[PDB]
Structure 1
Amino acid sequence: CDAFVGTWKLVSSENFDDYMKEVGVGFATRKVAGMAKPNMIISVNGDLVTIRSESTFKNTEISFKLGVEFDEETVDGRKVKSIITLDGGALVQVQKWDGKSTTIKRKRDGDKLVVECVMKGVTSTRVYERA
C-alpha cells in the first residue's frame, strides 16, 4: 500500500516487446507502446487504490479494492477481468481474458519499484525510480 504511493519514472526495460508479442499485441501497437515510456502514479484513498499511467500515446487508470475482481481496459485494447492482492509486501495482479491469463507483479527493490510481467513463460522486467 503505502510504500507504493508516489510518481514513478521508467529507468530500464527488459523483454517488454517479447512479452507483448506473447500477449498478442499487434506490431504498430507494440511499436508506439515501446516508444511511449509511460510513468506510473499510485495513490490510495480509503480502501481504494488507484494506479495511473501517463504517456503521449494513451493514459490508463484503474481504481480497485484489493481482493475484488474488476473490469479493466488495457493500454493495448484488451478488455480483461483483473484482481489484485497484497502478498508478501507485493501487489500481485492477474488478468484474465478469452481463456488466457497473465500475471503482473509490482514490488519494491531498494529505492526502486520493479514491475515483472509473465505470459506463458516469457518474463519482462521494468524498473522505475521516484520522479
Structure 2
Amino acid sequence: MCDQFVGTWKFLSSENFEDYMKELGVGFATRKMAGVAKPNVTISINGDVITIKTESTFKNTEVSFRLGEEFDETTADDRKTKNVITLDNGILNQVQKWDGKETVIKRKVMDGNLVVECTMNTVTSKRVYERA
C-alpha cells in the first residue's frame, strides 16, 4: 500500500560513490572509510519536523528540519552547509549549498527500498537501502 520514509533502513549497495565524493571534495582517505561503512538511516517524524539519523558509520549524524525552511548542517566531512528539503510526490529533494557550490540529494521509497540519488556537477551516485 504505502511504504513511506518513516522507519529504519540498512545499506544494501552503492554505485559511483567514489567519483561523487571526489566531486564534493571529500579528502582521499575520508573517501576510504565512507566506502567500507554499511550505514543504517533512521527517518523519524515528530509533528511537522523530520529527523534523519545516520548510524553504523564512521561518524554518526542527526539532522532535524521542517520542509521548505532553510537549515544549517555540518556534514560528516566537515562541510558547513545550508540546506532546503522539499517533498513532491513522495520524493524528498535536498539542495545543499556551501561556497557557491551545490549538491542535490534525492530520496524516494520504492517497495521497502530507499533510493538516495546524489548529484553534483557531472557526477551522480546511487545508494540503495533495505527496510529494517
TM-score (norm 2): 0.95
Secondary structure, in 3 states, of the residue corresponding to 2:29? helix
Distance in 1 of aligned mates of 2:33 and 2:99: 24
- Deviation at residue 101 of structure 1 after TM alignment: 0.2
What is the percent sequence identity of the aligned residues?
Answer: 72
2:112 alignment counterpart: 111
Partner of 1:124: 125
Matches within 5 A, 1:36-75: 36-75=37-76
Partner of 1:76: 77
Q: CA deviation at 1:55?
A: 2.3
**Structure 2 CA distance for aligned equivalents of residues 55 and 75 of structure 1:** 13
Root-mean-square deviation (CA, aligned residues, Å) is 1.1
Matched, 1:93 2:113: no
**Comparing both structures, which one devotes a greater share of its residues to helix?**
1
The number of aligned residues is 130
SS of structure 1 residue aligned to 2:104:
strand
CA–CA separation in structure 1 for the residues paired with 2:125 and 2:29: 19
How far, CA to CA, are the matches of 1:111 and 1:8 in structure 2? 9
- TM-score, reference length from structure 1: 0.95
Using the TM superposition, name which of 63-72 and 48-57 deviates more. Answer: 48-57
The structure 1 segments of at least 4 consecutive aligned residues displaced by more than 2 Å after TM superposition are none
Query: Are 2:25 and 1:24 aligned?
Result: yes
The AA in structure 1 aligned to 2:67 is L
SS of the residue corresponding to residue 20 of structure 2 reads helix
Q: Which runs of 5+ in 2 are unaligned?
A: none
